[PDB]
């Protein structure tokens, strides 16, 4: 029904919000050599997935880390330097985060139009019978 | 038979539940910024059983130190859906008396 | 609204603090017997449901 559109579009609104927050944590950790949890932060990605289970909502199935190797930088005098003297920094790519930031915002706003479009159809469907 | 309970069906109770649901969503939006507040959800089937409750919503994302589990994207959509369904319940329950009055008066 | 606003604000705020630490280093180039201060960022995740 038209109410299923609200569930489908609403799921995308939450879905694009997850990717926006993941990108925000990527931009804020692009230069963080250290990290609690004994893990040099690596770029995270939200992998969307259609949950077919007509109406196909979108669900986040889990956040996946980047496969790119960490950026090694020779800083011998740093306390975190290894024997060779290289400290490692996250593999966050700025350009893809900016592209993800644009795409997530554009996709978020176009889901609002569909919810608005379905809202008007239900209101007119209610005016029938009056 | 021929009683208001059977003539009105369950549409006499649904209008009340949609009002309670709207109140809870209004509370969630207002308390979105106050830290420590846990988003409250209302179970529709519970008030269905009460006709013939006030649960907590588990977050999809972690907090940021506030402890507030209100997602404003979700609340707006749930308030829009409840308001649309509330008007339909008024239309359903309103027409119950309009048909009932036409049967009695014959005009 | 969305919590990414404060998630990015909590990152921009720390960049200014890191900038202050580097500013103290350059102000102390002529100082005698001054040991330079290192600046680093720690990644801390908000563990919980979700």
């Amino acid at each position: 029904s038209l109410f299923n559109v609200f569930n489908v579009t609403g799921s995308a609104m939450s879905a694009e919000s997850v990717r926006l927050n993941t990108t925000s944590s990527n931009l804020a950790n692009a230069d963080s050599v250290s990290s609690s949890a004994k893990d040099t932060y690596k770029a995270r990605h939200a992998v969307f997935g259609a949950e077919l289970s007509d109406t196909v909502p979108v669900k986040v199935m889990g956040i996946v880390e980047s496969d790119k190797p960490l950026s090694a930088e020779y800083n011998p005098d740093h306390p975190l330097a290894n024997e060779e003297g290289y400290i490692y920094k996250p593999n966050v790519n700025v350009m893809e985060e900016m592209a993800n930031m644009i795409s997530a915002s554009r996709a978020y706003q176009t889901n609002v139009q569909v919810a608005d479009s379905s809202k008007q159809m239900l209101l007119r469907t209610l005016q029938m019978g009056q | 038979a021929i009683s208001f309970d059977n003539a009105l069906g369950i549409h006499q109770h649904t209008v009340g539940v949609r009002e309670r649901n709207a109140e809870v969503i209004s509370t969630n939006i207002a308390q979105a910024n106050t830290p420590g507040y846990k988003a409250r959800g209302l179970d529709f089937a519970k008030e269905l059983q009460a006709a013939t409750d006030k649960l907590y919503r588990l977050p999809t994302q972690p907090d940021t130190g506030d402890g507030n589990t209100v997602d404003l994207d979700l609340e707006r959509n749930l308030f829009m859906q409840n308001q649309i369904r509330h008007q339909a319940s008024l239309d359903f329950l309103g027409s119950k008396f309009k048909n009932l009055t036409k049967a009695i008066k014959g005009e | 609204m969305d919590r990414a606003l404060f998630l990015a604000m909590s990152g921009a705020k720390q960049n200014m603090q890191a900038l202050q630490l580097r500013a103290n280093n350059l102000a102390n180039v002529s100082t005698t017997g001054f040991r330079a201060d290192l600046a680093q960022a720690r990644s801390m995740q908000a563990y919980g449901e979700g």
């Binding site: - | 649960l55 907590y56 | 563990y47 919980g48």
Partner: peptide
């Protein structure tokens, strides 16, 4: 979904070993 008990808060420690 819904639950009958409040969800726990979020932990943001500077050292996970001390929680």
């Amino acid at each position: 979904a819904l639950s009958n008990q409040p969800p726990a808060d979020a932990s943001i420690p500077q050292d996970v070993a001390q929680m």
